[PDB]
Amino acid sequence: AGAGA
Amino acid sequence: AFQAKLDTFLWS
Amino acid sequence: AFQAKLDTFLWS
Amino acid sequence: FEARLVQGSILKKVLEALKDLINEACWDISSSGVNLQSMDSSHVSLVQLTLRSEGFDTYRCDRNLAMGVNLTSMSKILKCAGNEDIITLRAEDNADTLALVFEAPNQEKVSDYEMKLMDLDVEQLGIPEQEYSCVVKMPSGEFARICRDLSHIGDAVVISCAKDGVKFSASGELGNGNIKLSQTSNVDKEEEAVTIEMNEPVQLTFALRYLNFFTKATPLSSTVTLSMSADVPLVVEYKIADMGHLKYYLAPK
Amino acid sequence: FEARLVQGSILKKVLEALKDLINEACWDISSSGVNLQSMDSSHVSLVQLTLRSEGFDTYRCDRNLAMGVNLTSMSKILKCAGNEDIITLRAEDNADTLALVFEAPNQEKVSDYEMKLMDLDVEQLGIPEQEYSCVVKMPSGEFARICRDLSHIGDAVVISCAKDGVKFSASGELGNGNIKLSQTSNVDKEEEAVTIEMNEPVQLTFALRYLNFFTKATPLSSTVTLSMSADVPLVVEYKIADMGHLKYYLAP
Amino acid sequence: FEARLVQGSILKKVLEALKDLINEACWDISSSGVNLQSMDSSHVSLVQLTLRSEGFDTYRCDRNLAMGVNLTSMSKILKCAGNEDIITLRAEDNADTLALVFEAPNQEKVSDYEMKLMDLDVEQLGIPEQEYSCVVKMPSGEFARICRDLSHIGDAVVISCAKDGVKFSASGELGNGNIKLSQTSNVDKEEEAVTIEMNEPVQLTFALRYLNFFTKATPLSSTVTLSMSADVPLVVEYKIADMGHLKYYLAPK
Numbered sequence: 001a002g003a004g005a
Numbered sequence: 006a007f008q009a010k011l012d013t014f015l016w017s
Numbered sequence: 018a019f020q021a022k023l024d025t026f027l028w029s
Numbered sequence: 030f031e032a033r034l035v036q037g038s039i040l041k042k043v044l045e046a047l048k049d050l051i052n053e054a055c056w057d058i059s060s061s062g063v064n065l066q067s068m069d070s071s072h073v074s075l076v077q078l079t080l081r082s083e084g085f086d087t088y089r090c091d092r093n094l095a096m097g098v099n100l101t102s103m104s105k106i107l108k109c110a111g112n113e114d115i116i117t118l119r120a121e122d123n124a125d126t127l128a129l130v131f132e133a134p135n136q137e138k139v140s141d142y143e144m145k146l147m148d149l150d151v152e153q154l155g156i157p158e159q160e161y162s163c164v165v166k167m168p169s170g171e172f173a174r175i176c177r178d179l180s181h182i183g184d185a186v187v188i189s190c191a192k193d194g195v196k197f198s199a200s201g202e203l204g205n206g207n208i209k210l211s212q213t214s215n216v217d218k219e220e221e222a223v224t225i226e227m228n229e230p231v232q233l234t235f236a237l238r239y240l241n242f243f244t245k246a247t248p249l250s251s252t253v254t255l256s257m258s259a260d261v262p263l264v265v266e267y268k269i270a271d272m273g274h275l276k277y278y279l280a281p282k
Numbered sequence: 283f284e285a286r287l288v289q290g291s292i293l294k295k296v297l298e299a300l301k302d303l304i305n306e307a308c309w310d311i312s313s314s315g316v317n318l319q320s321m322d323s324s325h326v327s328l329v330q331l332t333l334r335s336e337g338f339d340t341y342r343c344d345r346n347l348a349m350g351v352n353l354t355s356m357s358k359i360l361k362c363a364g365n366e367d368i369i370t371l372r373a374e375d376n377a378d379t380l381a382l383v384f385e386a387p388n389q390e391k392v393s394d395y396e397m398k399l400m401d402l403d404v405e406q407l408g409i410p411e412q413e414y415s416c417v418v419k420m421p422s423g424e425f426a427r428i429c430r431d432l433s434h435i436g437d438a439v440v441i442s443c444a445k446d447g448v449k450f451s452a453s454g455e456l457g458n459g460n461i462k463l464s465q466t467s468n469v470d471k472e473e474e475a476v477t478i479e480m481n482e483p484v485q486l487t488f489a490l491r492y493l494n495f496f497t498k499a500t501p502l503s504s505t506v507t508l509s510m511s512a513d514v515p516l517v518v519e520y521k522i523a524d525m526g527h528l529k530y531y532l533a534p
Numbered sequence: 535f536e537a538r539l540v541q542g543s544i545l546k547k548v549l550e551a552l553k554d555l556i557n558e559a560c561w562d563i564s565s566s567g568v569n570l571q572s573m574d575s576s577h578v579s580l581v582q583l584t585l586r587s588e589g590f591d592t593y594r595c596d597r598n599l600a601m602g603v604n605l606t607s608m609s610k611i612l613k614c615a616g617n618e619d620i621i622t623l624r625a626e627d628n629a630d631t632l633a634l635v636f637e638a639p640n641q642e643k644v645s646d647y648e649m650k651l652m653d654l655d656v657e658q659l660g661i662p663e664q665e666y667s668c669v670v671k672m673p674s675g676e677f678a679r680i681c682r683d684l685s686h687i688g689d690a691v692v693i694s695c696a697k698d699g700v701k702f703s704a705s706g707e708l709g710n711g712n713i714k715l716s717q718t719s720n721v722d723k724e725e726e727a728v729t730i731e732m733n734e735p736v737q738l739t740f741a742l743r744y745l746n747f748f749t750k751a752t753p754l755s756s757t758v759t760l761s762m763s764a765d766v767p768l769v770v771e772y773k774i775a776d777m778g779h780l781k782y783y784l785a786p787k
Contacts, residue, residue, distance in 0.1 A: 003321060003328035003515045003531045005409065006234060009280040010072035014262055016155035020741060022577050023785040026767050027659035102456035109431035109459060126457065137466055137476070138424075142435070142459040171643070178614035182647070194642070203607045204631065204649040206614065211642035223642060355708045362683035362711065379709065390718050390728065391676075395687070395711040 030058055030094055030120030033087030037116030037131065039249070039269065041107045043078065046246035046267075046275060048104035050239075051076055055151045058094040058120070062273070066154060074239050075156060075262075075278040084272020087117075094120060096127060097147030103129075106142045124148075156262070156278050163190040163257040164226040167210065169267065172253045173244035175208050180237045182206045185282055189232045190257060195225060199237070220251050231257045234282040240265070243277045283311055283373040284342040285335075290369035290384065292502070292523060294360045296331065299499040299520075299528060301357040303492075304329055308402040311347040311373075315526070319406050327492050328515070328531035330410060337525020349373060349380060350400030356380075359395045410529060414509040414517075416443040417479040420463065422506040422520065424474075426497035428461055433490045435459040443510065444483040447476070452490070473505045484510045486534045493518070496530040535563055535599065535625045538592035542619035542636065544754070544775055546612045548583070551751035551772075551780060553609040555744075556581055560654045561601040563625075567593070567778070571658045579744050580661065580767070580783040589777020592622075601625055601632060602654030608634075611647050625651075661783055666761040666769070668695040669731040672715065674758045674772065676726070678749040680713055685742045687711045690787055695762060696735045700728075704742070725756040736762045739787040745770070748782045 034040060047054070047065075054067035054076070062082035068075045082088040110116055110131045119128035124146065131140040175197055179186050183199035183206075190196075194211040213222040246267040247253075256264035265277040287293055300307070300318075307320035307329075315338075318331035335341040363369055363384040370383040384393040428450050432439050435452035442449040447464040469475040499520045500506075509517040518530040539545060552559070552570075559572035559581070567587035573580045587593040615621060615636040622635040636645040680702055684691050688706035695701075699716040718727040751772045752758075761769035770782040 001533045002325045003533045005412070005515050005531065006282045008073060008236065008282050011068055011075050011156070011262060011278060011280045012072055014157060014278075014280070015075075015153055016157045017153070018787070020578055020787055021785045023573060023580055023767060023783060024577055024659075026661060026783075026785065027580075028662055029659055099456070105434040105456060106459070109434060109461075137464050138461065139464075140431075140459060140461045142457060144457040145455075178645075181610050181614055203610060204647060206611070206645065206647040208643065208645045211644075213642060221641075358686050358708065359711070362686060388720070390716045390720065391714065392716075393683075393711065393713040396709040398709050 030091065030122070031087065031089045031117065032063070032082075032085045033115065033117045035086045035115050037110055037114040038112045039272075040116050041110055041112070042246070042248045043269070043275065044100060044104045044107050046249060047076060047078070048100045049245065050074065050242045052101050053097065053099055053147065053149060055149045056094075056096045056098055057151070058090055058096070060090050062088070069239075073236065073280050074242070077156070077276050077278070078269075078273070079275075080269060080273040084269075091122070094124075095151050096120070096124070097149035098127070098144075099147060102144060103127075106144055109140060109142065159256075159258055159261060161256040161258045161264075162227070162229040163195075163231045163255075165190060165195050165210075165255045165257070166222070166224045166252055167255075168221050168223075169244075169247040169250050169253040171210075172255075172265075173247045176237055176240040176244055179206060179208065180241055184237055185234055186237050186240065187232065187234050188255075188257065188263075189230075190225065190227060191230045192225070192227050194223075231259055233257055233259065233263065235263055235279055236282060239277075239279055243279075246275050246277075249275060283344070283347055284340065284370065285311075285316070285338050285372075286340045286368065286370040287337075288339050288368050289523070290363055290367040291365050293369050294363060294365070295501045296522070296528065297353060297357040297360050299502060300329060300331070301353040302498065303327070303495045303530075305354050306350070306352050306400060306402070308405065309349040309351055310406055311343055311349065313341070313343045315341070317406070317408060319408055322492075322495075326489070326533055327495075330408065330529045330531070332526040333522065334526050337523060347373065347376070348402070348405065350402035351380065351397070352400060355397060356382075359397060362393065362395065410517075412509075412511065412514060413481075414514075415480065415482045415511040416484045416509070418443060418448055418508040418510075419473075419475070419477040419479075419505055420448075420508070421473050421475075422497075422500045422503050424463075425506050425508075426500045429490055429493040429497050432459060432461065433494055437490050438487050439490050439493065440485065440487045441508070441510065441516075442483075442485045443478065443480065445478070445480060448478065484512060486510055486512070486516065488516055488532050488534055492530075492532050496532070499528050499530070502528060535596070536592065536594045536622065537563075537568070537587075537590050537624075538620060538622045540591050540620050541775070542612075542615045542621045543617040544777075545621050546615060546617065547751070547753045548774065548780070549605060549609040549612050551754060552581060552583075553605040554750070555579065555747045557606060558602065558604050558652060558654060560656045561603060562656065562658075563595055563599045563601065565595045565598070571660070574744075574747075578741065578785050579747070580781075582661075582781040582783070583774075583778070584781075585774065585778040589775065591620075596626065599625070600654075600656050601630070602652040603632065603649065604652065607649060608632075611649055614645060614647065619645075661767070664763070664766075665733075667732065667734045667736045667763040668700075668761070670695060670700050670728070670760040670762070671730075671757055672728045672760075673726045674749075674752045674755050676715075676728075677758045677760075677770075678752045681742060681745045681749050684711060684713065685746055689742055690739050691742050691745070692737065692739050693760075693762065693768075694735075694737045695730065695732060697730070697732050700730060736764055738762055738764070738768065740768055740784055741787060744782075744784050748784070751780050751782075754780060 688704035
C-alpha cells in the first residue's frame, strides 16, 4: 500500500 | 492491624 | 580529556 | 431511555473518578434517575453514584434498566467529548448498546459513539446506613493534598477526630507526619470552612492508596464530607452539584 | 548556499512536524528554494515539503545542492534555538556539514551549530499532481483533536465526504464512533470554518497512526486541507506562511 | 533549634537543588546561621550552602550542632509543604529527630513531621578564597538553557571567557555547537544583563552533567555568577533569596 502519488 | 473487606458490613 | 577530583583543591 | 445534560463535563469527571477504581459496573436506570454501585476488586472499597433524573436538562426512562458497563471503555469515549459539550445518553430500549452523543456548543460538530454493553449480574445494593460519631466537612482540594502528602510518609493513615479538630497521622521509614485541621467556628467561611459534627471521639485507620483513588472525584465538588464511626467503613462524599452525589465507602484497618 | 529566516519558529515547527515521521531526508536546494521529500520506513506515507526562496529574507544558492540530513538530529539542534531567534542555514561548499546560526533578536546572544550530513545518492521525485473529487478545508486543531479522539475507538478512520458535510468514523472492540462536521454557513475567524469543494462524494479508510503523525504539523497552520479521490492517496496539506507548504500523502 | 522561615518555597527549592546531587549531608547550625558543606559521592563537585541567622523570621541556637540528614527524605517531606507555608525547623532533642512544621499562612492547617537523623562526621576541608581571572554574571534561566542545550550536543562544555564576551562550546556525534554571549549593552533595570569582569582570559572544560545538576537551583535566583581561573574549580553561585547563598564548585576536566 505504497503512496506513490 | 486488619484490612477488612466490606462484605461483613454489606447488608445481605 | 578526563575528570579531575576536587579533593586536591580543598584546604588540607 | 434518554438523558440530556448541558454540562457534559460533569459526566467526564464522574468517569475519571471511577475508571481506575472500578473497571466494570452495572448502571441502574429508573424514572428516579441513575444509580451505580460497585465494590472494587479487593472488596475493601465500594462506590455509590446517584444522579437524580431531575438533575438532567432532559430525562426519559420507560423501563427499569440495568446495563453492564466497562468504565474503561466509557472513559475512553468520554475523553472524545469536549469540556463544554452537551452530552446525551441514549438507550436502544432493548438490551444492546449504549449511545453517547456529544454536541459541540455551537451545533456544527456532532459526535455519536455507540458502546457495547456487558451482561453483568447485579446484586446487594446495601451498605448498612449509620448515624455517625463524627462528620467532618472540608475543602476537597485540601483532602486530596492531605492524602497525597501522607502517602509520602506511610501507607496507612490514622484519622483522630475530637471536638476541637481532626488529625491525620502517618508513619513510615522516613519518620512520621501529623496534619491537624482546626474547626472553623464563628469565623465566616462557607465553601472553605472546616466544620466538625462530633458525637463521640473517633480514631480510625485506613489505607492511603484507596483514599488517593477517592480524591480523583475532587473536580466534581469543592467540598468533601467524611463520615466516621468506629469499626465501620468510612464514607467519603462528593456532591455532584445540584443533581446528586458520589460516595466512597472504605473498610477500616 | 545561505538561507536566513527571521521567523525561526517556523523552521523549528517544521522539523517537529517531520522528525518523528521521517528520521532521514534529503534536502534539495536551488534558487527556487528548498524541496524536501521522503517516504517513511514502511513506505505507506509520503512527506513533501516546499519552501520557496522568496519567503526567506536572504537566499543564496550557487549550485543545485543535495543534503542528506538526519531530521531528529536537526530537530535536536533546533530545540537549542529560541522561539524568536533569527535562524540562518549555511552550507557554503559541500563541507559535509550543515551550519545553523541562531541569533537572539537583540543580538547579545548568537549560537552556531554544525551538523554532519549523510550520504544519500538515490534522489527525489516530486509529483503533487491531480484534480480531486473532494477537497476539505478545516481547522487544523479540530482535525488533530479528531484523529487523536478516534485513535481511542479504533486504528482506522473512515472519511465519508458529501455535499452537506464530512463524517469521520471508527470502529473497535468497545464500540464505534462517528464525528460529523457540517459545512459552516459562512466562513470567518482565524478559521473555525469547514469548506467542501466537491465534484463527487467519496469514502475512504486510512490508518489513524499516520494521521496522528501528520497532525504534528498543526502548529504551522490554522487550517488543514484534505484532498481525496478514490484510488489515490489522501493529501493532508498545511500552508506554511507565504513561503510554502507541507503535504502528507497517505495511501488508503 | 529553633528556626522559622515564612516563605516555604525557598526551602523546598533549596532541597530540590541538592537532593539529586548529594544524598546525605551535615547541617552545621551555629548562632550565625546554617551552613551546609558537602561534596557529591564522586568528589567532583562541592556544595556550600549558607543561610545567615538574621535572614530567618525566628532563629534560636542553644548549642552549636551538626545534624546529619538524608536530603532525599527531607525533600520528600518538604513536598508535603505548601509553597506559601511558614516552615519551622526544630531540633532540640537528645534522642535526635528533626521536626519540620508547616503552618499554612492564614488558615487552620498545621502540619508537623518528624524525621530521623543520622550521624555523619563533619570535616569542611573548604576551598581557599581567591580573586578569579574571570567573573561572569548572567540571568540564571539563560545559564540553565545553555547547559541543557549543549547537553544535547556533547558531554563536556568548553568555556572561553575573554574581555568582550564568553563562549560555550561542545562537540559530539551530531557535530558541534558554539553559544556566544556578548557583554550586554542594554537598558532595563531587570536582571538579564550579562556582565563580565575579566583580569585575564580563561579557557576551561567542565562536565555538563554536573552543571545540569547545578542549574536546578535556577528557581532560587534571577542571576548566576560564574567564577573562573586556569586549572582551578569553577564556582557557580546562586543567591538564596537575600538571606544567603548556594555555591557549587566543579573540578575542571
